Design a binder for this molecule. Sequence first.
Ligand SMILES: O=C(Nc1cccc(-c2nnn[nH]2)c1)c1cc(-n2cccn2)cc(C(F)(F)F)c1
Ligand SMILES: O=C(Nc1cccc(-c2nnn[nH]2)c1)c1cc(-n2cccn2)cc(C(F)(F)F)c1
Length: 263
Amino acid sequence: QTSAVQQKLAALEKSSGGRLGVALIDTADNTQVLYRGDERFPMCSTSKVMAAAAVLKQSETQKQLLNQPVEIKPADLVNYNPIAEKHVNGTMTLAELSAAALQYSDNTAMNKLIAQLGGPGGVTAFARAIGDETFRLDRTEPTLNTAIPGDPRDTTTPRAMAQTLRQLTLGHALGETQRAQLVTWLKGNTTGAASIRAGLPTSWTVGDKTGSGDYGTTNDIAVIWPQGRAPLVLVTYFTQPQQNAESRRDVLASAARIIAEGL
Ligand SMILES: O=C(Nc1cccc(-c2nnn[nH]2)c1)c1cc(-n2cccn2)cc(C(F)(F)F)c1
Ligand SMILES: O=C(Nc1cccc(-c2nnn[nH]2)c1)c1cc(-n2cccn2)cc(C(F)(F)F)c1
């Protein structure tokens, strides 16, 4: 069956020229709305949530882990390092790296999280341990954002990412304090006001992680507390066939607006 919401999302997609993937979980009734929900999309920096969450899980058996220093050397800086470049020839704690990766989208900070987990496969191993059989992280920053059509590397599906984000932020994949920490970090994101948030009523509260890359890839994953109802989890992924395409945060906002109007 195709719903009215799905027809609206298909119209939005057709007007955009690209490929749009949406998954909503409404935690009041556990129902789901999907559009291309089982197709693969490049995650880009939305993968930083899984990396930070994997380090939070390690912290549950090491009370001092988030205070642990990690060396930032000049050779470690990559292509987008707004926080890490202030700490070159110094250190950042795993908490500081997590906050930088999530709230500022710092790519050097992400690379330190991946290294703490033993490489991209250590992030995938955590995803499997929390029931996500779809997520895969194959590369470090910045090349995990190449976003080449048909490339399986560094991809997931909307359905899988929405289920995982629900389990991490609202369910019991993390201990209570760690889940609260992840929620606090997401709610303090600096990069999201033009993406999912821009399609939602202003009274609703959002925590989110954005991503973008080549092929005009533009992504956002969010946990949403709407006024007067239980939380929603929403993933909006978008990628374009035209390699030099501009990113389209407004398409993510428009998908969120359609979803909100359908509730
Ligand atoms: O910094 C970024 N992108 C980046 C960084 C370094 C190199 C290149 C690149 N390499 N080759 N060509 N461009 C691109 C970047 C982009 C966006 N964004 C643009 C459109 C939609 N979202 C948002 C953010 C932020 F959320 F963090 F704020 C960072
Ligand atoms: O690293 C990147 N982008 C980035 C960096 C930091 C934060 C964010 C972000 N966060 N939230 N939204 N965007 C995005 C990035 C971007 C591009 N690119 C090419 C055309 C447009 N883009 C290519 C590459 C790669 F060639 F190396 F693969 C990496």
